[PDB]
Amino acid sequence: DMISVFIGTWNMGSVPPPKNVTSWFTSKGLGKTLDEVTVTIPHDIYVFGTQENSVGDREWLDLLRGGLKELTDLDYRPIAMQSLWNIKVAVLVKPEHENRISHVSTSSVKTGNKGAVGVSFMFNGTSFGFVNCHLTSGNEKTARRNQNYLDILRLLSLFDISLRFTHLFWFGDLNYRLDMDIQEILNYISRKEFEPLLRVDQLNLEREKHKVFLRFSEEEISFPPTYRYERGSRDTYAWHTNVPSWCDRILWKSYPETHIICNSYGCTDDIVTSDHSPVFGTFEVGVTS
């Protein structure tokens, strides 16, 4: 059997969301987007990961539930929710999949605010893991980001979580920056040449050097850096130093010989309340039953 899993990551920048966040749910915007045909099919599982979320726990889940209801005309059932100050993750499933969910667990790890929130459950015989984080900010603090990851990986009681679930998803504001000057970054962005920028992306570099996210996978990035935008539009980056970077990412680690296909991976361009652009990721996951 096949199920559609949606993963959303968005640093809200300590402000409430706009009334229209439809593009985030429907993988509409820039990068690897879902086509106008595939968007009509509602996803089986919706996973929302947020950082710098000023909206209260109950009020935020109501907005997601209400937002999904206006889009799909379906009353999505919240399975789990874990919050750590302004970092919060929520998992909602199709009402028909209620009896298919078992062994629900939640955990939170505080760093240095900063840290992570986790959610884990089982869809029939297939186990799932979801980690929403907010790592240390700053271009020169890559060492702290690597330490933050290793700390969450060993303290999140959801022996290591890297081999605990059939499909493990790690997402959030990882805060990894570009190892390049502002002159070159804005010159490449103006020509929409993201490949030379992605070669000096700190997360891509630390993964290639096998420092962090061992045997983890990430879909190709074809969308512009999601940080740091001027609020109210997506036309200009607020750099003056916070150079444009791919801070918001979705990664996955799956068990060998399992079915997992990434259908979309990108960002929206119509949600402008935050200095961060929301990031989406959809997947076709195989379930044993």
Side-chain angles (χ1 to χ4, degrees), residues 144-158 160-171:
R144 280 209 234 265
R145 280 186 279 275
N146 291 8
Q147 191 54 50
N148 281 173
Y149 162 79
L150 291 163
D151 285 2
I152 295 151
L153 195 76
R154 71 159 215 269
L155 287 155
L156 199 89
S157 59
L158 220 63
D160 199 283
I161 55 144
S162 58
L163 301 148
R164 275 189 205 176
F165 322 105
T166 320
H167 298 272
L168 176 69
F169 295 91
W170 201 298
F171 53 97

Side-chain angles (χ1 to χ4, degrees), residues 250-280:
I250 299 156
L251 290 97
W252 74 94
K253 196 191 176 181
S254 300
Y255 270 7
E257 313 283 29
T258 58
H259 194 99
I260 180 145
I261 312 298
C262 185
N263 292 163
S264 76
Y265 187 52
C267 72
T268 65
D269 51 24
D270 60 353
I271 301 159
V272 296
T273 52
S274 177
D275 56 344
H276 284 259
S277 270
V279 168
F280 45 77

Side-chain angles (χ1 to χ4, degrees), residues 210 236 243 273:
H210 293 350
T236 322
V243 295
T273 52

Side-chain angles (χ1 to χ4, degrees), residues 83-98:
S83 64
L84 189 81
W85 300 297
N86 299 99
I87 314 154
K88 43 201 89 186
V89 65
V91 172
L92 293 97
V93 304
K94 283 175 99 177
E96 56 191 280
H97 297 315
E98 184 197 309

Side-chain angles (χ1 to χ4, degrees), residues 57-112 114-158 160-194 196-211:
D57 274 28
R58 183 192 59 87
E59 288 84 351
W60 180 59
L61 186 70
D62 285 331
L63 285 157
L64 299 169
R65 200 148 41 170
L68 287 170
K69 177 67 185 176
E70 189 59 70
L71 178 71
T72 69
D73 202 56
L74 255 65
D75 294 288
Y76 274 79
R77 199 161 174 92
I79 285 302
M81 207 198 144
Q82 187 57 49
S83 64
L84 189 81
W85 300 297
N86 299 99
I87 314 154
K88 43 201 89 186
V89 65
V91 172
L92 293 97
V93 304
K94 283 175 99 177
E96 56 191 280
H97 297 315
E98 184 197 309
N99 298 340
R100 289 187 180 103
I101 307 294
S102 59
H103 300 84
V104 185
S105 184
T106 54
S107 189
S108 58
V109 174
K110 51 179 184 176
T111 61
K114 304 285 185 289
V117 281
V119 166
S120 63
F121 63 91
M122 281 190 78
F123 198 102
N124 293 320
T126 310
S127 57
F128 287 88
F130 298 93
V131 180
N132 172 47
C133 74
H134 191 192
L135 313 182
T136 310
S137 59
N139 286 262
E140 288 277 284
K141 290 183 181 185
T142 316
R144 280 209 234 265
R145 280 186 279 275
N146 291 8
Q147 191 54 50
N148 281 173
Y149 162 79
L150 291 163
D151 285 2
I152 295 151
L153 195 76
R154 71 159 215 269
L155 287 155
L156 199 89
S157 59
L158 220 63
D160 199 283
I161 55 144
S162 58
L163 301 148
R164 275 189 205 176
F165 322 105
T166 320
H167 298 272
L168 176 69
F169 295 91
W170 201 298
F171 53 97
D173 181 359
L174 315 207
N175 251 318
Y176 285 95
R177 313 296 174 91
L178 299 185
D179 280 337
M180 215 182 250
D181 187 72
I182 189 72
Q183 191 191 90
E184 286 71 51
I185 288 166
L186 293 181
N187 281 329
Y188 280 131
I189 284 168
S190 74
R191 288 187 169 186
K192 283 172 181 70
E193 287 168 23
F194 309 127
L197 300 171
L198 285 161
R199 293 293 272 240
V200 293
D201 166 79
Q202 279 161 4
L203 181 65
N204 286 344
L205 292 160
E206 294 305 296
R207 272 181 72 234
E208 276 159 14
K209 283 170 187 181
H210 293 350
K211 278 242 197 284

Side-chain angles (χ1 to χ4, degrees), residues 19-28 67 71 268 270-271:
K19 282 188 178 184
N20 178 37
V21 285
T22 305
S23 292
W24 188 32
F25 310 140
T26 55
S27 297
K28 193 191 177 183
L71 178 71
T268 65
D270 60 353
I271 301 159

